């Protein structure tokens, strides 16, 4: 037989567990396939539902009740405008995808057990897997043993004060103009 | 708010506006109808604007509260964790926990109040400082005397000084009318 890899579209002759395992792990095949599912995944969001319309005959009553109601104006952007605003909206969705607020990890940084939990390499459940998840690293740290005895006083000109809460770019003019107190 | 605004943006039909709020409050407060029959598109575009305005208002209030709470208190708190019984905390941090607890008490939200006591309690558990206050607000504001006794009892374990807690505890037990205890 021969193993056709349809992601790469390239044949490999006389399939064997070794050669096939080597190809599947291969970097090029990796990029090709990952990109393939990136496209096939972006399509379902890209594809418009385009559900079918069923139009019934409007009744005499609701045509009279809806005729007295005034006609609302509709807004339609220019092509040059709508291309840009679609770009912006899509790039905003991509932003909300990657946010993943971690601030808890920033709060406990100096806790006595911070090295056993949030480092995630040295954990128990996920710890052993990360080692086998390390790449083959072909060519070209926070150890767990830490104690409270290091950094006895968490504040000696060490810490940065907590980052301010974010704000929407649209409504950024909503902010109260002036603070209540004088910061330096 | 970005998830909410986006999910408002993705609403393609009037029927999906009932997901926000019921049919009556939309026709009354914002005066928009789901059963509206006619050319719907511009009407739904008007409805998204009228729905986004009030969300902008909610954003006004909640933004104000967050910026106050951060700008005054939360920005001054550098240690959110327990450390050890041999840790010392800075005086300004004590002061900001005290004032943050008074502010939280002023909000009169019991869940967030007990939370902000237990939140304030782990950074400094060993002083007896926040134990006494957290017995006081619960003995007077809420008027719950047993809860205060139980606060002082749990305070006997963590606090190192123990003298003020055990005096105020003697008093709480006296007024509670438990003499055998």
């Amino acid at each position: 037989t021969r193993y056709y890899c349809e992601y790469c579209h390239s044949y490999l002759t006389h399939d064997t567990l070794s050669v096939r395992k080597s190809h599947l792990v291969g970097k090029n095949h990796l990029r090709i396939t990952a990109d393939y599912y990136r496209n096939k995944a972006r399509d379902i969001i890209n594809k418009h539902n385009h559900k079918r319309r069923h139009i019934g005959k409007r009744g005499r009553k609701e045509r009279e009740n809806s005729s007295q109601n005034e006609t609302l104006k509709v807004t339609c952007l220019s092509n040059k405008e709508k291309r840009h605003i679609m770009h912006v909206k899509k790039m905003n969705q991509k932003e909300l995808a990657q946010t993943s607020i971690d601030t808890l990890k920033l709060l406990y940084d100096g806790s006595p057990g911070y090295s056993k939990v949030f480092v995630d390499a040295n954990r128990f459940d996920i710890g052993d897997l990360v080692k086998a998840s390390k790449l083959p690293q072909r060519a070209n740290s926070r150890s767990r043993d830490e104690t409270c005895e290091s950094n006895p006083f968490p504040r000696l000109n060490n810490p940065k004060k907590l980052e301010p809460p974010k704000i929407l770019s649209q409504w950024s003019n909503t902010i109260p103009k002036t603070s209540i107190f004088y910061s330096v | 708010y970005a998830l909410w605004l986006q999910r408002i943006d993705d609403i393609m039909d009037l029927k999906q506006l009932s997901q926000l709020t019921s049919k009556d409050e939309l026709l009354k407060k914002l005066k928009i109808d789901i059963n509206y029959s006619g050319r719907k598109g511009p009407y739904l575009q008007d409805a998204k604007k009228k729905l986004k305005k009030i969300t902008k208002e909610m954003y006004m209030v909640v933004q104000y509260q967050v910026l106050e709470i951060y700008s005054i208190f939360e920005s001054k708190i550098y240690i959110n964790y327990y450390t050890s019984p041999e840790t010392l905390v800075s005086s300004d941090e004590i002061e900001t926990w005290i004032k943050y607890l008074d502010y939280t008490i002023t909000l009169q939200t019991d869940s967030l109040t007990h939370l902000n006591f237990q939140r304030a309690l782990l950074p400094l558990a060993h002083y007896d400082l926040v134990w006494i206050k957290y017995s006081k607000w619960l003995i007077n504001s809420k008027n719950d005397l047993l809860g205060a006794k139980n606060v002082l009892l749990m305070g006997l374990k963590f606090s190192l000084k123990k003298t003020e807690i055990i005096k105020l505890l003697y008093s709480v037990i006296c007024k509670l009318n438990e003499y055998v205890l």
Partner: peptide, 26 residues
């Protein structure tokens, strides 16, 4: 991908009188 969804809020200082001074004691 030039503008971003979120920014840190910037806010004006209130002239520093003895009422807006966070260090005031007396």
């Amino acid at each position: 991908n030039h503008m971003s969804q979120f920014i840190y809020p910037v806010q004006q200082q209130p002239s520093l009188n003895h009422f807006t001074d966070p260090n005031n004691t007396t």
